[PDB]
RNA sequence: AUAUCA
């Protein structure tokens, strides 16, 4: 650690977090592909509330819905906001992303693209789990703090 | 071993030799000590040639 | 009180009987005998008969004459050991004369030969003794040896030592011991994770081979392409004589199982299990191109071979490969697509079961999955290649003697020296193969018997060789079967196993009486299986051959167990019921190492679960001990004791001590070692005596339970070099 | 026990030895998935020919064809029981059982071309 | 998920979108068959699985002598007679939670004092 | 007749398919054709449908043992019987209305 | 060639 913050355990944690590699895969419980044809209204009643907001204060009818683990999202400190931001910043303007709030019971990320689309989304979910880096440096796994 | 129930993580099941050499080992203790004992003989045997070539 | 529970000292009265009957080298003798009485005949009858046909030019007389000549091999005979001296005279030969005059203790092999002749004109075949073939060396104390039915005083007159135990051969006057060779059991389904840098993540392997007959060592690999996190995870399988790995689907289609879902039914047995089914969608997509049985066989036929260009040719091939080289156990017959399809589906089920993290990768070091090739099978392997060497030298003669019509002289036809010196070579030198042009041949299979001390001789006749995951370590499965201490230090450490006192090796029985029994006892045949109709069906195997399913295994298992414990089903036959996996595997198989254990039954009117053997049987044995009518066989047929191999051991629950580990609690000596308890109410078996886990050498170590592990391993190596009286002769 | 009840028992003529097709009584089995309906105006005609031997079954052209393959044997065996007008039963052993074993079809102008495209793949 | 097959072919079904009426169908790529979808869910991944935990629980589970017993009172029949095992999902991560199977009512109860189950 | 043609199932004749133990069939072969080979009789009992097979006394000297039959379903399959005569004509004789297995006794 | 020795 940096000269000053040598005894600061909280500084150690900060670097641990900034260096230990984290992928979208490590936080995900399961990914699902649904046919939700109305972008404005959802067939999953759970998600109904997430739309009602991430709309107020054109796209694919095929939906990629993934559930993240609150317990996992905490040990490798992360926010729904920051996770979502990575996906959004990975696929730019060719993927429409929405996400359930850190407060909300279930942790969800709803994604849509911008004939033939089924296989296309199965590629997008593989890119997502395997190639999207959230936190950390590549090749750097299991970072332990030591006194 | 077949003398144990399944999903037994007890010291006695996973090789803890409770007894002294003066007291003697139970058949289970005896066989587990034998497994552990064999491991050392294997490296003694192997190391011998690996170590030799390093020297060369 | 003849039905009183047995004490701890009483276990020795049983051990006394085990050795009174079996002796210390039952494995060596029982193997050889099986080979002489049975195996030998079947080797003469597999290829056996050879024919030569002489069809004419059909011009005119003396043409237009088509003939076919036969040569057949009937019963095989084998004399007592003999010797052919320089002056013609043949006479009996005793082991002592062999060792002194450096002869070979061999006996004569005689086979009934018949030579038929047939003929046709320009379609109708119309018809127009006992021959010596070689000298086979006898193993001492075997049925064929003179010393087998020999009394004590008898042996002494014969200048042999009664303490000598037999189990070796006499080749040119030196004693030779066949060393048991350890190999992986065949016809066995095993799933393994293929390492981090690999296209294929997991493989299902089956080392398929015939019990006897040519022995096609074709190993089928069922490969799961793509890694944990790669898209398009397809399943392809490498078929013998086919360069490429064919997507599973096409194989099923070529088999006759044409629509998806009919194919899926053979792989996944639960219509509910969406997880495994999603994993099959890519395969269905991969095999979508091929839609009928024909186009599937062409696709298989295209991928050679070499290629073998011609449409009619390639489709005809694939037929042959699937029949003769694909899954050769089960059947090599024709109409058995249904059987081989369900098997492939059982393999894909296991491949996916491991990849879905429901089952563990197969332990390549489980002793139950290993076989020991003893003196029997070793001679059988050699005799096969030696008899096909003779068979095809007689044919070369039948051509030479039909060309010049030189009168097919028998003595000129059969070369005795072929099998005689062919066996003498192996046994002598030790390169287990044909012949003075040996490599790769396996040297050290036959070796000169250690005669330093008596113990040294004993431990040499119980030695095991393992040629080439972590083999050197002492496995849990080695309990009661192999000595935990008797192993060398250096290079061979843990690759040279020594058999525990009570260990025996399965000679190999017939599967049909059991297959015939099964069908009759509620076993639905695989040919008529409908997975979703009977979905909880317990799948039944006999030597890695899936025969069918059964609806109430609970009752079947009890019937089969009663069949063995009666003697109706042989006691050396292994039968295991893995309830959780819904499987019942049976082994009539040769080479399995087994140990005898006391049977414990909940069955007792008066009280708890108690060991079948009672103080009355114990005195019934010690009555016979004083006579030198109640043998070890007597305990075995009265179902008091049973034979349990490593695979079967998996499903049992053993008590160490009987008395100490039976009645529950209703001061304590401090000097005695700290012991556990008889908490189990489930006990199926009890240990005869725990000291029996030790081999010949470790069994001379006083208080080995008070020494550091290797100090014991050292003594079981040194005692072999300790001087003493080796034999009284 | 005593039979307060009545049983209707019919004499069974264990297989008559001499029958015209004593030699051949076979089973033709179709999988329900195939959905073959014998009562079809179309399936009025049907031809059964040995393919040179699997059996080939075909309706008028434009209709599906099925191939028949022989199933493996066992210790038990099947008999066909037929009943005469008089209640008596005559049994005949099944010579062979075939699983049919037909077409689709929609397999023309394809197969060989699809594999080639698949090769244009690797 | 739980997918269907084509009646007529028995061959599997591929999803097709009916662009006009904005609805999901399942087409057969061997014949001209089509059927409307039961659920909007077409594909489910599932990374953090729980399916494997209580596998092979044949009613004969009591007949395994290798299985250990306990005097834990059942949530249903209150029977202190049961066999127990750990999560049969052969993964590294896996918790040491125990599954108890009643030697009477056959109900599967756990020792999990963090969470509450139904499998 | 019409060569290569199949005959008449249209009549909807029904037949039963019964699985018999090998040993029983062996016994049946013994019966003389001249006799008409009457092997024994089939019993249909009510109070639930129960069907059994009993060998004729002539077949064996003992008390005839009934062989119970387990009725089974058609299964998802259509089974038809076709016969081939010495003439090699092929006829579609009947459809299998019921399946049964004769258990060994 | 196996076995063995420290
Ligand atoms: Mg020294
Ligand atoms: Zn279809
Ligand atoms: Zn209960």
Molecular structure report:
- This is part of a larger assembly, with two copies of chain A, one copy of chain C (729 residues), one copy of chain D (122 residues), one copy of chain E (119 residues) and one copy of chain F (105 residues).
- Helix content of chain C is 30%, strand content 20%.
- Chain C has 729 residues and is of the alpha+beta class.
- A four-stranded antiparallel β-sheet of chain E has the order 5-6-7-8, with no helix packed on it. Chain E has a three-stranded antiparallel β-sheet with strand order 1-2-3, with no helix packed on it.
- Chain E is elongated, with a radius of gyration of 22 Å.
- Chain F is mainly beta.
- Chain F is built from one helix and six strands.
- One zinc ion binds at residues 6, 8-9, 11, 28, 30-31, 33 of chain E.
- Chain C binds one RNA strand of 6 nucleotides through loops.
Question: Which secondary structure elements does this structure contain, and how are they paired or packed?
Answer:
The structure is cut from a larger assembly and holds two copies of chain A, one copy of chain C (729 residues), one copy of chain D (122 residues), one copy of chain E (119 residues) and one copy of chain F (105 residues).
Chain D: E1 7-13, E2 24-31, E3 47-50, E4 55-58, E5 65-70, E6 77-83, E7 89-93, E8 96-102, H1 112-120
Parallel strand pairs in D: 1-7, 2-8
Antiparallel strand pairs in D: 3-4, 4-5, 5-8, 6-7
Chain E: E1 13-18, E2 23-28, E3 34-36, E4 41-44, E5 69-70, E6 82-86, E7 98-102, E8 108-110
Antiparallel strand pairs in E: 1-2, 2-3, 5-6, 6-7, 7-8
Chain F: E1 14-20, H1 22-30, E2 38-45, E3 50-55, E4 66-72, E5 77-84, E6 90-102
Parallel strand pairs in F: 1-6
Antiparallel strand pairs in F: 2-3, 3-4, 4-6, 5-6
Bound molecules: magnesium ion and zinc ion (2 copies).
One zinc ion is lined by residues 6, 8-9, 11, 28, 30-31, 33 of chain E.
Chain C binds one RNA strand of 6 nucleotides through residues 429-431, 443-444, 447-448, 450, 488, 492, 717, 720-721.
How far do the termini of chain F sit from each other?
45 Å
Rg from alpha-carbon coordinates of chain C: 29 Å
Give the overall shape of chain C: globular
Helix/strand-derived category of chain C reads alpha+beta
Oligomer type? part of a larger assembly
Number of structural units classed as domains of chain C = 5
H/E series of chain F: EHEEEEE
| Share of residues in helices of chain C | 25-40%
Biggest sheet character of chain C = 6 strands, antiparallel
Could you tell me which ligands this complex binds, including any ions or cofactors?
magnesium ion, zinc ion
N-end to C-end Cα span of chain C: 47 Å
Alpha-carbon Rg of chain F, integer = 17 Å
Which two chains have the most extensive interface, and how many residues on each?
D-F, 49 and 52 residues
H/I helix tally of chain F? 1
Share of residues in strands of chain F: over 45%
Beta-strand percent range of chain C: 15-25%
Provide a count of the helices of chain C: 22
Main sheet overview of chain F: 6 strands, mixed
Kindly name the structural category of chain F. mainly beta
Portion in helices of chain F: under 10%
């Amino acid at each position: 650690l940096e000269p000053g913050h040598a005894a600061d355990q909280e500084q150690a944690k900060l670097i641990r977090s900034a260096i230990e590699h984290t992928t979208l895969k490590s936080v995900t419980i399961a990914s699902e592909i649904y046919y939700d044809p109305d972008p404005r209204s959802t067939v999953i009643p759970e998600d109904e509330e997430i739309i009602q907001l991430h709309f107020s204060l054109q796209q694919s009818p095929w939906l990629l819905r993934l559930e993240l683990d609150r317990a996992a999202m905490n040990d490798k400190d992360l926010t729904m906001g920051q996770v979502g931001e990575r996906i959004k910043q990975t696929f730019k303007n060719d993927l429409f992303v929405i996400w359930s709030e850190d407060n909300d019971e279930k942790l969800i990320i709803r994604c849509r693209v911008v004939a033939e689309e089924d296989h296309m989304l199965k590629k997008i979910e593989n890119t997502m789990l395997e190639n999207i880096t959230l936190r950390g440096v590549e090749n750097i796994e299991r970072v332990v703090m030591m006194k | 071993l077949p003398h144990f129930s399944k999903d037994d993580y007890s010291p006695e099941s996973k090789g803890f030799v409770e007894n002294s050499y003066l007291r003697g080992l139970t058949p289970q203790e005896f066989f587990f000590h034998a497994m552990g004992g064999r491991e050392g003989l294997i490296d003694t045997a192997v190391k011998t040639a690996e170590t030799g070539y390093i020297q060369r | 009180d003849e039905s009183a529970p047995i004490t701890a000292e009483d276990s020795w009265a049983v051990i006394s009987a085990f050795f009174r009957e079996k002796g210390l080298v039952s494995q060596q003798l029982d193997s050889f005998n099986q080979f002489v009485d049975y195996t030998l005949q079947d080797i003469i009858c597999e290829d056996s008969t050879l024919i030569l046909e002489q069809l004419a030019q059909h011009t005119t007389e003396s043409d237009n004459i088509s003939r076919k000549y036969e040569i057949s091999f009937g019963k095989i005979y084998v004399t007592k050991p003999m010797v052919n001296e320089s002056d013609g005279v043949t006479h009996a030969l005793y082991p002592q004369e062999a060792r002194l005059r450096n002869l070979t203790y061999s006996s004569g092999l005689f086979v009934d030969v018949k030579k038929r002749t047939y003929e046709a004109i320009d379609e109708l075949k119309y018809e127009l003794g006992k021959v010596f073939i070689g000298r086979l060396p006898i193993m001492l104390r075997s049925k064929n040896c003179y010393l087998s039915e020999a009394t004590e005083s008898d042996l002494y007159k014969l200048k042999e030592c009664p303490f000598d135990m037999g189990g070796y051969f006499i080749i040119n006057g030196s004693e030779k011991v066949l060393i048991a060779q350890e190999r992986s059991a065949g016809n066995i389904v095993q799933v393994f994770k293929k390492a981090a840098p690999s296209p294929i993540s997991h493989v299902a392997e089956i080392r398929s081979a015939l019990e006897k007959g040519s022995r096609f060592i074709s190993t089928l690999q069922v490969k799961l392409y793509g890694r944990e996190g790669s898209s398009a995870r397809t399943i392809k399988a490498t078929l013998p004589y086919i360069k490429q790995d064919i997507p599973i689907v096409i194989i099923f289609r070529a088999l006759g199982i044409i629509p998806d879902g009919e194919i899926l039914e053979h792989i996944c047995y639960d219509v509910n299990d969406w997880q495994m089914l999603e994993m099959l969608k890519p395969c269905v997509e991969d095999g979508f191109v091929i839609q009928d049985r024909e186009t599937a066989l062409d696709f298989i036929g295209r991928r050679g071979t070499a290629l073998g260009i011609k449409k009619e040719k390639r489709i005809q091939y694939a037929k042959d490969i699937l029949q003769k080289e694909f899954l050769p156990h089960i059947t090599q017959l024709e109409g058995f697509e249904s059987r081989k399809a369900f098997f492939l589906g059982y393999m894909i089920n296991r491949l996916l079961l491991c990849a879905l993290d429901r089952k563990d990768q197969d332990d390549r070091d489980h002793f139950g999955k290993k076989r020991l090739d003893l003196a029997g099978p070793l001679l059988a392997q050699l005799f096969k290649t030696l008899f096909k060497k003779l068979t095809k030298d007689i044919f070369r003669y039948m051509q030479r003697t039909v060309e010049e019509a030189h009168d097919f002289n028998m003595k000129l036809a059969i070369n005795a020296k072929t099998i005689t010196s062919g066996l003498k070579y192996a046994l002598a030198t030790g390169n287990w193969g044909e012949q003075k042009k040996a490599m790769s041949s396996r040297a050290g299979v036959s070796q000169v018997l250690n005669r330093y001390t008596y113990s040294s001789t004993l431990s040499h006749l119980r030695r095991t060789n393992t040629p080439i995951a972590k083999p050197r370590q002492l496995h849990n499965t080695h309990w009661g079967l192999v000595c935990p201490a008797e192993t060398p230090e250096g290079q061979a450490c843990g690759l040279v196993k020594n058999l525990s006192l009570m260990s025996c090796i399965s000679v190999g029985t017939d599967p049909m009486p059991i297959i015939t029994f099964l069908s009759e006892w509620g076993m639905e045949p695989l040919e008529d299986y409908v997975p979703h109709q009977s979905p909880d069906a317990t799948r039944v195997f006999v030597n890695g051959v899936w025969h069918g399913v059964h609806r109430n295994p609970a009752r079947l298992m009890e019937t089969l167990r009663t069949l063995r414990r009666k003697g109706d089903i042989n006691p050396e036959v292994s039968m295991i019921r893995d309830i959780r996996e819904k499987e019942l595997k049976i082994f009539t198989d040769a080479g399995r190492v087994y140990r005898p254990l006391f049977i414990v039954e909940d069955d007792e009117s008066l009280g708890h679960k108690e060991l079948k053997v009672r103080k009355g049987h114990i005195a019934k044995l010690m009555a016979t001990e004083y006579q030198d009518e109640y043998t070890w066989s007597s305990l075995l047929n009265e179902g008091l004791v049973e034979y349990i191999d490593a695979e079967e051991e998996e499903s049992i629950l053993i008590a160490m001590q009987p008395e100490d580990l039976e009645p529950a609690e209703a001061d304590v000596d401090p000097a005695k070692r700290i012991r556990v308890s008889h908490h189990a109410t489930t006990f199926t078996h009890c240990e005869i005596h725990p000291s029996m886990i030790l081999g010949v050498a470790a069994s001379i170590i006083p208080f080995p339970d008070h020494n550091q592990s290797p100090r014991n391993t050292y003594q079981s190596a040194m005692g072999k070099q300790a001087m003493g009286v080796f034999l009284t002769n | 026990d005593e039979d307060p009840n009545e049983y209707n028992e019919f004499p069974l003529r264990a297989i008559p030895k001499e029958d015209l097709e004593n030699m051949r009584t076979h089973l033709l089995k179709f999988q329900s998935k195939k959905k073959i309906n014998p009562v079809t105006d179309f399936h009025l005609p049907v031809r059964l020919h040995r393919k040179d031997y699997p059996w080939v079954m075909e309706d008028f052209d434009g209709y599906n064809t099925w191939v028949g393959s022989y199933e493996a044997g066992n210790s038990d065996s099947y008999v066909l029981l037929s009943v005469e007008d008089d209640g008596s039963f005559t049994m005949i052993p099944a010579d062979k059982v075939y699983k049919f074993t037909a077409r689709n079809k929609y397999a023309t102008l394809t197969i060989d071309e699809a594999e080639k495209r698949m090769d244009k793949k690797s | 998920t739980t997918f269907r097959f084509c009646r007529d072919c028995n061959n599997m079904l591929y999803p097709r979108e009916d662009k006009e009426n904005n609805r999901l169908l399942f087409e057969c790529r061997t014949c001209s068959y089509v059927e409307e979808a039961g659920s909007p869910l077409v594909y489910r991944h599932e990374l953090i699985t729980n399916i494997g935990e209580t596998a092979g629980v044949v009613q004969d589970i009591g007949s395994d002598p290798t299985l250990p017993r306990s005097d834990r009172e059942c949530p249903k029949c209150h029977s202190r007679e049961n066999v127990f095992f750990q999560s049969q999902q052969r993964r590294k991560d896996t918790s040491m939670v125990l599954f108890f199977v009643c030697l009477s009512c056959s109900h599967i109860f756990t020792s999990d004092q963090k969470n509450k189950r139904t499998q | 007749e019409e060569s290569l043609d199949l005959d008449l199932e249209r009549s909807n004749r029904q037949v039963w398919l019964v699985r018999l133990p090998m040993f029983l069939a062996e016994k049946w072969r013994d019966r003389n054709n001249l006799h008409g080979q009457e092997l024994g009789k089939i019993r249909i009992n009510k109070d639930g449908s129960k069907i059994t097979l009993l060998l004729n006394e002539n077949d064996n000297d003992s008390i005839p043992h009934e062989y119970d039959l387990e009725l089974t379903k058609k299964v998802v399959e259509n089974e038809y019987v076709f016969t081939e005569q010495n003439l090699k004509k092929t006829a579609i004789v009947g459809t299998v209305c019921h399946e049964c297995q004769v258990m060994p006794s």
